[PDB]
Amino acid sequence: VPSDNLPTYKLVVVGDGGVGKSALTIQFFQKIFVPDYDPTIEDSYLKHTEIDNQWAILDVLDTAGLEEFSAMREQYMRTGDGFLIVYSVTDKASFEHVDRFHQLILRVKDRESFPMILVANKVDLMHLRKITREQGKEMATKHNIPYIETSAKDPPLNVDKAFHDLVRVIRQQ
Amino acid sequence: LNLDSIIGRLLEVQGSRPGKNVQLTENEIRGLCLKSREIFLSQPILLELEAPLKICGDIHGQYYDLLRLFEYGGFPPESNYLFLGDYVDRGKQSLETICLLLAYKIKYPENFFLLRGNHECASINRIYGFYDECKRRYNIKLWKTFTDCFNCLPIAAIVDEKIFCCHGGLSPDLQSMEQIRRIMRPTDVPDQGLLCDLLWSDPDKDVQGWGENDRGVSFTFGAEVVAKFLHKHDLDLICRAHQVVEDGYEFFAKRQLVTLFSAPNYCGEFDNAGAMMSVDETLMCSFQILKPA
Amino acid sequence: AQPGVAFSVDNTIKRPNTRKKSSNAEVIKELNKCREENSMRLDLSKRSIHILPSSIKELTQLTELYLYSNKLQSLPAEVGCLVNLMTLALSENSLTSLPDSLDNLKKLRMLDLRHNKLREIPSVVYRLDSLTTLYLRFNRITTVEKDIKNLSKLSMLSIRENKIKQLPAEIGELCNLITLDVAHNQLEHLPKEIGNCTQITNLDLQHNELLDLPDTIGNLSSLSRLGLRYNRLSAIPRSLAKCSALEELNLENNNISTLPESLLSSLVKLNSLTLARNCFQLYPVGGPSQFSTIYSLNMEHNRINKIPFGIFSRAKVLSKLNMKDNQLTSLPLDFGTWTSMVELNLATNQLTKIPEDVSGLVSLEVLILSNNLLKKLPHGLGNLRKLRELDLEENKLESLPNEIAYLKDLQKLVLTNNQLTTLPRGIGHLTNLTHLGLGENLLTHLPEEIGTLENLEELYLNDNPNLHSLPFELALCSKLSIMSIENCPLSHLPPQIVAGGPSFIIQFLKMQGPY
Ligand SMILES: Nc1nc2c(ncn2[C@@H]2O[C@H](COP(=O)(O)OP(=O)(O)NP(=O)(O)O)[C@@H](O)[C@H]2O)c(=O)[nH]1
Ligand SMILES: [Cl-]
């Protein structure tokens, strides 16, 4: 039973197209893996959940990765309290565009630092992996942000932890 | 698939002694599941329906009571129908019940609608009858085909912008109707969350706000939660099922919510009546009662 | 006209029974703050706005207006004064119309009308010829008027999740379209003039009622994403071969029986082909160069009666083949040449034997042979040293070869619904086996070598009427968490113990055994 007048954390998932932003989000909320690719314009999801024995409302904004679908992306990012920067370990360009999304977050929020976590997705595709764990930790340390590896495919890996850790950053806990 | 022969054979036992089974072939039942599944996926998960319409609650395999509903309200397509789920389990003829409903869904896809109930779930109907009936009369592989079909049923419906329909009830996570549209199909029912609450939650006159449900799953919600939900979304009524009520229908929160249960003499242990709700084009709602026979 | 709920009960008619001024005061304050700062962007989203105040007419400097997630049924005519507006975001409202004054917005590029209640495209939208992006997803639209030709600058048009039955031929005048999404509608045909939209790279037609595709579809030479699943397509046009940038051709759930000969050979970027849920009785005709680029081939739920010889001779990267639910009675003679095959599904066919040259599939990790007519298994099955999953459910297997002990990587072995009486004593060499399904069989006993299955977690012995006892060595399976014994009498065990279930049974074997 949720408490009354709960805090809402507006989490925004950003990253290049096809990295798995929607699959991670649907896995987090519906606990299923969606194998088909349908490009996102914008979708939002809401749940009440208890993190570290503190109740919270999680409003997750799932944004567009494709440039053709990316109109109004900055407005949806402007409303966020924290960000998941997602890239696919099988997509080299998605890893190289982390710098661009890091800059966009700070620019849209008009701050020098902001809660964000680097998410390396699709680690279940070991034979197709092109970005090493060391490269990811180097990128995260360069931006002074946490690093986590996820997989939206069943059985899911670190999917709930990624969203919960971002809430922990926002709380400063 | 010859729909008319299947429907005719299902309707043949009208007036016979209660319990007389109908023998469809395994490939005929498989065709009903596969063809109805396609239609469910071709239609929204949040149905937007128009009156006139007749709305029915739990059937639970009581096939001859289902035939009484159609005889009273008019067999399709004489009247439009919306069922709120729980078609299998508990009763003795779940196969006949769901096969006729699926046949009508294929025959009249724009005038006949079926929502998902908490018993349209593999983990639930494995325990409470449908698995045993499928195994006894056919095979377990057919039971899995039903599960694939159930996993694509729509979850809720809104009639003429004013009546929100679902099997169970409200959810603390239900803040916008678009959240329902974002539920992906095919899907199983999770043990917790939005889709779970829509099929499992119950109203409670004693609870203020949200409370724990004695079912062990989902929540209970009070009258003020109902009032705030209707005001926020500009709705007039919540129409749900899920709970057995003595008169077949029962009001809640000053007639802001109604529970419909359409299985008279439920499980052989209750002395309850069944009811459907008729909604005319002006949204005037009346109740047709099935007394326990 | 909007009806309201009432109840005809008790011989009468009964009816079901916050701070709007305060909410509108906060909106007015946000409007004044916008002019004082002379900001070019106004965010009034998620403010429960039903009627937008007419004071918006003063904010003529606006280039972006965000009003999504409100309760707007209409927009005031004063919005037409915002002649500098470039973005109008109105998703998730209750809009049924738009004011004619919007034609003053000669610089509008983005109009987002997703999740509303439009029964038609508002007539003023057809006059906004400056638009480049138009979203109309999740409405109640049935008709696209011929006036759509006025929006010739559109590069993105999405009208999915509506009730559209036909598109006008004037859709061909949208020559600047890059993405066209008309999924989840009721289209039966596409106008042949769609071939004039030669810049389209993404065309989504999934979940319609399309009986065919126009022969002009090949004019979309830059098409890289094409959605065709869940339609009624009876054929594929030859011109589709010109769309050589297609990375995937998924035709699942249609009525297609053939493909144009050598069509796939022109799709040189094709990494996946799916012909599932169609009417194919034979493979796509055309030489093996048609399968030289795909990694996966899915042809489940068809009527394919034979796999041609040498069909995969040039399929070097084809590692997944799904042939479930077809009409296969035998396998080709070069079955053993499928050395690239990693996952093979031959379930629900009429196979009577698996050939001995299956040993050539050394890279095979998943082999699914469920619902066939197998009476035995070849000895060459033991050469599949990489096999993790072997599914043999619903066959007529009367025995297992002793060479099954060589499957050192086998983790899941499903033998449900067969005629097995005993298991080879080499079954204990499958050290990685975690799942062993032996239900619906005729087993008289389990070999004592079952105690060498150190990783056995799930064992299924249900529906075995002739299994009267279990070996004491089964207690040596320390990870055994699941054991199904439903409809399994076990006569040689005490009836109170078998009624107590696997917990009492495993402990009996443990406490009444020599371990
Ligand atoms: N194997 C595997 N596939 C994954 C994983 N995550 C996503 N995918 C697949 O990759 C594809 C793209 O996923 P999706 O969530 O749609 O990507 P996206 O970031 O939302 N793209 P966009 O921004 O355009 O909407 C889908 O086919 C999805 O099933 C993963 O962890 N493992
Ligand atoms: Cl409607």
Ligand SMILES: [Cl-]
């Ligand atoms: Cl409100």
Ligand SMILES: [Mg+2]
């Ligand atoms: Mg996405």
Ligand SMILES: [Mn+2]
């Ligand atoms: Mn129920």
Ligand SMILES: [Mn+2]
């Ligand atoms: Mn029920």
Ligand code: NA
């Ligand atoms: Na959800």
Ligand code: NA
């Ligand atoms: Na069909």
